[PDB]
């Protein structure tokens, strides 16, 4: 279930219900998503269990998923995995004192946070310092900017460090006039196609990378 579009894991500790409501509201109002659009997260009330959160005409509903490997919404219908429970309830509706068939998964917009090239706290000067110690064109990093939902790709090209602004615009990311589903998708595209002149993103830079392929002092 870990790589599934709909599996968000632990959201935030006990603020996860409100985070899930926000994520579903954002996806659903933005894309014009149908009822039953959903995500699964770790329960913050029932530890070890999961919570299914879904869209219902502007209102978010939450249902407990018991995990004993036995997964279930009701003591009547038990599944071996979270994928099987979700797949079954996409074809057959779940009942409450309304009926709801699960429809489209709400994907995570933050999968970049675990990538080796991503830095949540890094200044423009800080990125230039790190990249001037990597004498390879195509060395790059992505850093969060001070504006919310704004990032920068810092890269080495023609012996100098250049920067590109990436904007998270609702459920997609924009780099100039090019649009991707997420920051991870944008970076994976620019590793196979040039971002600046003929330069592709080739060498992801972090602290571990600097001790291996980096110099002690900048140029």
């Amino acid at each position: 279930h870990s790589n599934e579009k709909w599996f968000h894991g632990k959201l935030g500790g006990r603020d996860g219900r409100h985070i899930a409501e926000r994520l579903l509201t954002e996806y659903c109002i933005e894309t014009g998503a149908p009822d039953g659009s959903f995500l699964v997260r770790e329960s913050e009330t029932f530890v070890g269990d999961y919570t299914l959160s879904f869209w219902r005409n502007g209102k978010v509903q939450h249902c407990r998923i018991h995990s004993r490997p036995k997964f279930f919404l009701t003591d009547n219908l038990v599944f071996d995995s979270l994928y099987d429970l979700i797949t079954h309830y996409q074809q057959v509706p779940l009942r409450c004192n309304f009926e709801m068939r699960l429809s489209e998964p709400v994907p995570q917009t933050n999968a970049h946070e675990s990538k080796e090239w991503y830095h949540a706290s890094l200044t423009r000067a800080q990125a230039e310092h790190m990249l001037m110690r990597v004498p390879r064109d195509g060395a790059f990093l992505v850093r969060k900017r001070n504006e919310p939902n704004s990032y920068a790709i810092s890269f080495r090209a023609e012996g100098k460090i250049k920067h590109c602004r990436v904007q998270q615009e609702g459920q997609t990311v924009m780099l100039g006039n090019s649009e991707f589903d997420s920051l991870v998708d944008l970076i994976s595209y620019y590793e196979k196609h040039p971002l600046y002149r003929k330069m592709k993103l080739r060498y992801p830079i972090n602290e571990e990378a600097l001790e291996k392929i980096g110099t002690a002092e900048p140029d």
């Binding site: 423009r124 920068a152 250049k162 920067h163 590109c164 602004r165 780099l175 100039g176 006039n177 090019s178 971002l195 600046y196």
Partner: peptide, 7 residues
């Protein structure tokens, strides 16, 4: 401009 344009 501090940031490069991409088209």
């Amino acid at each position: 401009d501090l940031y490069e344009e991409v088209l």
